[PDB]
A paper describes a structure:
Recently, our laboratory introduced the peptidisc as a novel type of peptide scaffold designed to keep membrane proteins stable in solution without detergent. When the peptidisc peptide is mixed with detergent-solubilized membrane protein and the detergent is removed, multiple copies of the peptide associate with the transmembrane domain, embedding the protein in a peptidisc, which can also incorporate lipids that may be bound to the membrane proteins. In addition, we show that peptidisc-stabilized membrane proteins (in this case reconstituted with the conventional ‘on-beads’ method) can be used for high-resolution structure determination by single-particle cryo-EM. Notably, the arrangements of the peptidisc peptides around [name] and MscS are very different, revealing the structural basis for how the peptidisc scaffold can adapt to membrane proteins of different sizes, shapes and symmetries.
Using [name] [name], we show that peptidiscs stabilize this ABC transporter as effectively as MSP-based lipid nanodiscs. Image processing revealed subtle conformational variability in the distance between the two NBDs, as illustrated by the two final density maps at resolutions of 4.2 and 4.4 Å. The slight mobility of the NBDs in the nucleotide-free state is the likely reason for the somewhat limited resolution of our maps as well as the previously published cryo-EM map of [name] in nanodiscs (also 4.2 Å). Like in the nanodisc-stabilized [name], our map showed clear density for LPS trapped in the transporter, which was not visible in any of the X-ray crystal structures of detergent-solubilized [name] . In the case of [name], we identified a total of 15 and 21 helical segments in the maps of conformation 1 and 2, respectively. The differing number of segments identified in the two maps somewhat exaggerates the actual difference in the [name] surface covered by peptides in the two maps, because longer segments in one map occasionally overlap with more than one shorter segment in the other map. For example, the longest helical segment in the map of conformation 1 overlaps with three shorter segments in the map of conformation 2. Overall, most of the helical segments overlap completely or at least partially between the two maps, as can be seen on the front face of the [name] dimer. However, the side face of the [name] dimer reveals differences between the surface coverage of the transmembrane domain by the peptidisc peptides, with the map of conformation 2 showing two helical segments that are not seen in the map of conformation 1 (red arrows). Most segments run almost parallel to the membrane plane, with tilt angles of less than ~15° for 8 and 14 segments for the maps of conformations 1 and 2, respectively.
Author numbering:
A (entry chain A), B (entry chain B): 11 to 541
């Protein structure tokens, strides 16, 4: 089905994948050929007792197994080539659209969800498609090979087991249908289990506060019981298959035994031939078992890949070209501003008009049910313009190049995110260059955060391995302030945190922000008194 | 190893594993017996051209596959009985000690970590141990019965393949050590990539603000290529495992044929017997490859189970025995109980050996690194105070009513992570104690929560599936206030935030809090001067 979208993404790499099947084909050869040697092994090695000829066979078996080996080698190798490269380009395009996704994309999801999606589902698409081809190639090779074996051995028993093939196959199909139909809603209750445990863990505070230990343990117990029972159902149903499969498969073999009646009274063949027939039967039963599950589970894979596409096929940041905006100061203007993050709410700014002049910064307004803070993120256009008007120097909504804005605007927040690099370069993120560490050094002096860097390792170029989680929030605030210093961004957004900081930290931040509001209009949210 | 710890937890269910092993031995019996009846085929059905046995044996095969079926039935069944029961009790005691876990030791890890621990590690211990037993028992019975088959057919070729098998096992041991090292490396590398991807994702806001997206793409692609190569080498080695095994196995078969040529002198065996030997040998090659990595795999399960035990055997909530069921009020009298949940900076706060006045509530004070809410958490003692106890009214941490401390001292919070139950009983989380739903209505009246009942279904007994995420935080705080009303806590703690609420909401809330401040000393996180 939706392979019409993958095959192109794989098309440049087709050749190697192709190679796989070739070797995979030889697998059956080996299999068949190994089984083939049974005829001379038995019917000639002891029918004719060519004791000497028996020395030919072993070297063959060895070579054939070596063929199995090398074939498996290249199978795994090229299949993994494809698997990787596909996962590669896939996750690349993901990362892309993730970037292209406006932050709204995160309003309806969580990080962990996207981590899971990207990593797991990516790997699963490739693993699926791979095993699909792997097994499919074997089916196209083992089945027909053993068929030819029986053919050049007995047209008759061939005919029989062929007439039997539909029977066993449809049996497998229907029992697999039973299986999957039982596996519809299990995920629901399993996630219910996980989520019950989850909410209890999250709420341990309230839990202890009320000490509902007994009630919650009772809940937990019912949950565990449902877990036990549904797991029982799962494993039972799944297990029954092979019996049922082999059971009816039995009769097939038994019907092959029923060749006692018809062709054996005609002295059908020799013993070793029949040994080949039955060994071949069992061989079939390996990929026979495969085929159906192949179709099903790899349809599942392709469906996961369809989910992936939908994530990609989802619309990126809706930008018809925010044109070109030169870096500039100017003034911020609020003409008839109204905005609702979802439709769930009413206009956050209820038709509000404001003017924030050049360099004349503006602090956290004091109000009730404001939320302007997130509205600053909309001044950064992280979500969609809902209504109203936010103007920059006589220019309407989307004359505003996202890149140009994020350059010219700045954001300082209580929340700060760090990145496993040199914290200096983490500041330098504006192309990570064009700003000598010397300039970064003086910024740190202006950031007043070099004091912490003294405690930090790797000196002035502190490489924050695993981000150096020990780095306090206010340190990160000074970090972002230094970043702003490097960007000379005419527009700033600020925030005051109070987790654990010192008079030196807060007051040096005050001074820094003071210089920042100069020549560059700032937006602030603070808990101080006069400010 | 720690089976010394598991075997008791399973002992009430020995019979399960017992009948499991019985069935598994019967399964091996079925296998061996099919392979055996292979012989009389060639003995008479082609040697003497018999039909009698040529019809007998069909029915035999049928019944024997039915035995495979029923054996698999009870195997899966009882083994799952045990797996479940174990997981059940395991997760049970895991909740238990998990409730007796200090809040700090939560904050040592993350919630998701514990979710994974419980769910996965439980079911993984189960699956591991189960498959371990299944294998060891099947494998053993299969190998021994096949040995017997060869024995009553050829002392000689038996002897040979006996001498041979250890070599196979050693080759497998080597490849499994390769597995060990490549596996630890693979775990390291996949941890790396998931960390990088996530840490990039979370920063989307900042990533945009700096708009360095190309750099993120670069890092993404680097780690992607690293993953490509890592998985490449991983699957490479894991594949290469098989061919080496099958190759040396082939060499073994070759020696078997060298044998066939050496008693080619005597030529005692029958084509049947030959077929039996080789078929059985391939059989072996299934359980051998299994059992080796099985005896390896004990650890995996037992390793996770040891982690579990450590969680159990970790420091549960250590109280010298709190007791004190009776309720009252008295007053609060802290006795130097230290703060250093994460021992990083230094120990700082109030240090009062003093006492707190009755009736009068408690508000919020502003100081650097005050940590009031968590200082309140220690005031509530539900977080582990680092040192000492608390002689309240001359009565220690437990001499004053610790468990009842929850009843005596209320803990309202801004974020009320509620539970997937009836909002009515959500108020009665504390093991509903004949809090008449009439009292629920009247409290919601005293709380001014009756309006949110209209927002919900299920009459005045509103129920919230998935907590009814529709509910905004403010009315949940109001619910918790009503709960405090129900528990008639003379002492309380409250919480005021400013995420999103209305004027009338905050007003009626502060009215209800005054009522709570009335004749009940509380601790109130607030942004106002009402206190």
């Amino acid at each position: 089905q939706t392979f019409r979208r993958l095959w192109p993404t794989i098309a440049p790499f087709k050749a190697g994948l192709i190679v796989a099947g070739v070797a995979l084909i030889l697998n059956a050869a080996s299999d068949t050929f190994m089984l083939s040697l049974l005829k001379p092994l038995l019917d000639d090695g002891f029918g004719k007792t060519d004791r000497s000829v028996l020395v030919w066979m072993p070297l063959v078996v060895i070579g054939l197994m070596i063929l199995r080996g090398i074939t498996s080698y290249v199978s795994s190798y090229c299949i993994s080539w494809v698997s990787g490269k596909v996962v590669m380009t896939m996750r690349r395009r993901l990362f892309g659209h993730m970037m292209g996704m406006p932050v709204s994309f995160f309003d309806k999801q969580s990080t962990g969800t996207l981590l899971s999606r990207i990593t797991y589902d990516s790997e699963q698409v490739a693993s699926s498609s791979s095993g699909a081809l792997i097994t499919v190639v074997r089916e196209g090779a083992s089945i027909i090979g053993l068929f030819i074996m029986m053919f050049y051995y007995s047209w008759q028993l061939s005919i029989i087991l062929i007439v039997l093939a539909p029977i066993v196959s449809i049996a497998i199909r229907v029992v697999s249908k039973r299986f999957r139909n039982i596996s519809k809603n299990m995920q629901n209750t399993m996630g219910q289990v996980t989520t019950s445990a989850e909410q209890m863990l999250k709420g341990h505070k309230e839990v202890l506060i009320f000490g509902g230990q007994e009630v919650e343990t009772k809940r937990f117990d019912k949950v565990s019981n449902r877990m036990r029972l549904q797991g029982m159902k799962m494993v039972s149903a799944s297990s029954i298959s092979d019996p049922i499969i082999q059971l009816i498969a039995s009769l097939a073999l038994a019907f092959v035994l029923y060749a006692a009646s018809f062709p054996s009274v005609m002295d059908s063949l020799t013993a070793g031939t029949i040994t080949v027939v039955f060994s071949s039967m069992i061989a079939l039963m390996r990929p026979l078992k495969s085929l159906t599950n192949v179709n099903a589970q790899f349809q599942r894979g392709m469906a996961a890949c369809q989910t992936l596409f939908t994530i990609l096929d989802s619309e990126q940041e809706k930008d018809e070209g925010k044109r070109v905006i030169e870096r500039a100061t100017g003034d911020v203007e609020f003409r008839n501003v109204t905005f609702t993050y979802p439709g769930r709410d009413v206009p956050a700014l209820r038709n509000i008009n404001l003017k924030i002049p050049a360099g004349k910064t503006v602090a956290l307004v004091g109000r009730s049910g404001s939320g302007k803070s997130t509205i600053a993120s909309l001044i950064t256009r992280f979500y969609d313009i809902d209504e109203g008007e936010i103007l920059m120097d006589g220019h309407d909504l989307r004359e505003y190049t996202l890149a140009s804005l994020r350059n010219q605007v700045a954001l300082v927040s209580q929340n700060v995110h760090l990145f496993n690099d040199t914290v200096a370069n983490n500041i330098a993120y504006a192309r990570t260059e064009q700003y000598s560490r010397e300039q970064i050094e003086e910024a740190a002096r202006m950031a007043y955060a070099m004091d912490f860097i003294n405690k930090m390792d790797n000196g002035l170029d502190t490489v924050i391995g695993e981000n150096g989680v020990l780095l306090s929030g206010g340190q990160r605030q000074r970090i972002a302030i230094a970043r702003a210093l490097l960007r000379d961004s005419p527009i700033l957004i600020l925030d005051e945190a109070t987790s654990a900081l010192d008079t030196e930290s807060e007051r040096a931040i005050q001074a820094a922000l003071d210089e920042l509001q100069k020549n560059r209009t700032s937006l602030v949210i603070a808990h101080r008194l006069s400010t």
